[PDB]
Design a protein around this ligand. Sequence first.
Ligand SMILES: [Zn+2]
Ligand SMILES: [Zn+2]
Ligand SMILES: [Zn+2]
Ligand SMILES: [Zn+2]
Lengths: 167, 335, 297, 95
Amino acid sequence: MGILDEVWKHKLILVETPDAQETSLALETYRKACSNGRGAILLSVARGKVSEGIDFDHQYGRTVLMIGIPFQYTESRILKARLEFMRENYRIRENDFLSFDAMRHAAQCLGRVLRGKDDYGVMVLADRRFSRKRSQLPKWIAQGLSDADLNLSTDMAISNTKQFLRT
Amino acid sequence: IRSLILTLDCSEAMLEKDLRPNRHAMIIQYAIDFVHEFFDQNPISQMGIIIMRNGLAQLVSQVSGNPQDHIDALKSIRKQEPKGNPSLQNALEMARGLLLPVPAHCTREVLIVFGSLSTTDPGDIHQTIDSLVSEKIRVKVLGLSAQVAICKELCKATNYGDESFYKILLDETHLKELFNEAVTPXXXXXXXXXXXXXXXXXPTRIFEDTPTFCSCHSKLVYGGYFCPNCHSKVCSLPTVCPCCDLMLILXXXXXXXXXXXXXXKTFAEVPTTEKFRSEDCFSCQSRFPXXXXXXXXXXXXXSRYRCEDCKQEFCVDCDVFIHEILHNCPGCESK
Amino acid sequence: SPSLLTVIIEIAPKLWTTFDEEGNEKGSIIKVLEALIVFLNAHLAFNSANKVAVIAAYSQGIKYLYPXXXXXXXXXXXXXXXXXXXXXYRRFRNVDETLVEEIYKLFELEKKQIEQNSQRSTLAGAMSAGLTYVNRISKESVTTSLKSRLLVLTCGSGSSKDEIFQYIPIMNCIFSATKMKCPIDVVKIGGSKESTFLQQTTDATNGVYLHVESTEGLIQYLATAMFIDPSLRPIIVKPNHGSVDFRTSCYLTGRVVAVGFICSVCLCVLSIIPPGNKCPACDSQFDEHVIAKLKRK
Amino acid sequence: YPEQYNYMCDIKKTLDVGGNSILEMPSGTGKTVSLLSLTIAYQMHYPEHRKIIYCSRTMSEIEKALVELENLMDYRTKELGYQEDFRGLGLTSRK
Ligand SMILES: [Zn+2]
Ligand SMILES: [Zn+2]
Ligand SMILES: [Zn+2]
Ligand SMILES: [Zn+2]
């Protein structure tokens, strides 16, 4: 809990049974954390509720983290029925169900970082299966986890110096 | 005229080894040179050092025009270790309590050297930012690498609605550049207010050291400045006398005003094939060609810095030397 | 070690007329220049590789008498002197030949236009270019830094040799000379008159001020200031006394005020006896509350 | 912006020709791009012709479309000075 006592302090974790008041209180306190020089950790579900979309400020998370790639609940009768239904229609068996669905659940995370050309943001993606799919503005460089810690320290200082240079 | 309040970060975030050997060993070291850069160009201004250690604000240097009080205050910080967390609210409220003796005629400045990324404030910090605009306090924060959303509102709302004061440092060479601009004043557009100051006596240079004389210490002295109002032989300084609240400056204020009135006219660098003049310098003797990149397409071209105030040819070396000290171009004094 | 001596001569047509009228002719301009050439040869013989630069300040503008100015124009011949026939260092004889060619051009340029242009002071441009050429000569010689010791030779004549227009640029030059760690060996020549700006420049730049009235001994005062300027100041020197001034004067009035008053955030010199109606120094508004408290006390 | 006029020229060419168009927009930069072009294509045709029908996915995008329409009416009442036939209805939930 060192990040929950010396970095982000308070914790904003979205549960599986996310209440509408609980999602409202975790959203306002996340805006109260960044407006006091604190910062908070928004532990949400990419498959859960509240897809958001409001940003365009420094109150939002400037660095957005994703745990791997979004997946879908397999071994269900609803999925096996829609698998054979679209197999006769478009013959996209075992392809779009694991990739086109996994992209749109990841593209909801991509819609929050791009908050205009005036605000910056860094979106990191794990694993290696993301290279087989496409993304909005496909300019992606692959590096390690400890390597990007020194890259993001440069990206949090170059963007503070190149903001008044391009104007 | 100026009453700067230095706000230094002295916490566990300064224990990192970003600089050489660390952040705290270069912030304290470069601030001693900033004291030397401040009292030379502004010998009749004030300074105040407030550290942010252990979630509080500790006053280690009182507001005074003596430069040696701020040197020995910074020599005690390097002995201990910076611990705790920065407190921006306790540092600004302590800076508010010292700038209230500072009048409206003297400019109130607050410089914050913030190398951390997270602070610990008691109450609401937004109630402290709006208080600095109500009494007109110019706050400037120097943030390290990443930007803080608090310092963007602090360097804009306290600075006439303009965010350009929250600077981001990336090198130790760039940190000394921030101490050169902060040593210079900020002649802004202001808010068009009235200004009138009087009661400025002159110090008589006395050298009596037989049984000595001291009105501000009652000790032995090798000569002190005599006040022209209360007739007291106190300490020799260009500040105010401590017996009747009257000044005692001389040519130190005149040298600061001459630098303030120095507009520094840069000489127009015209080529030797364009200005139709030989390679010569109005300050010395620059009889060498400037440009010499190509064969004869640049060596014969050259450059002669023609100052437009007297049409005198010069070079690039003395054009920055005349704008730094003395008068801008020596050909201006001759008609 | 080498020692650089910067001599700032103040050649003017009123200085030769005051020395040929006040106390009859107590020495012409070439009589003291020969004794200065004897002091220049003693400085070059006191230490090896001793550099010297001569820069005059005429009425129509300042000019360099020596410092390879006549050689730079020749590259881009003598005047038959007795000093050149007496041998002893050809570098000192070529400096006297270049000074004789520059003094002949000064008498050819002295006419009705030079006497009409003698209304200002060329010592402000000679001090601004003198510290810049000394900064250019010290930058050209990185190995073995010499001791830069400026020796101002102001000829206190008539007309308007000292005014408020040249005191502001000399104050910026004195702050530049104190920042460059250069001593200003001042020498008040001519009539019996001591300037407060020349006394404050010798106290701020750690120089020596010598008041030479009329003429007296030319080499007697040239062998005393040559023993403290080229040296590293091992003694406590022997400068002129009664130089302790307030270093301030009311420019809008014309008299020295003990208690001054600031302008409207401009730091201009103003008397406390003024009412300050919209600050008599620039175009700005004054404080009515500060004018109400100053009129009561 | 010139990049916003590229999708606006495509929206002015598909609304008077095509029946359905899959137009891709960058994230955080395409909200008011099709908002002003929908009121301009009606003003280029007839203002009582085809009205605007908006289909969001959340209630927040319903609320975010109302404040942008206020900016469209403020840009039409300050740059023109004429108050035309207003519209806009906030069809939200029943509770
Ligand atoms: Zn006093
Ligand atoms: Zn030059
Ligand atoms: Zn000039
Ligand atoms: Zn004024």
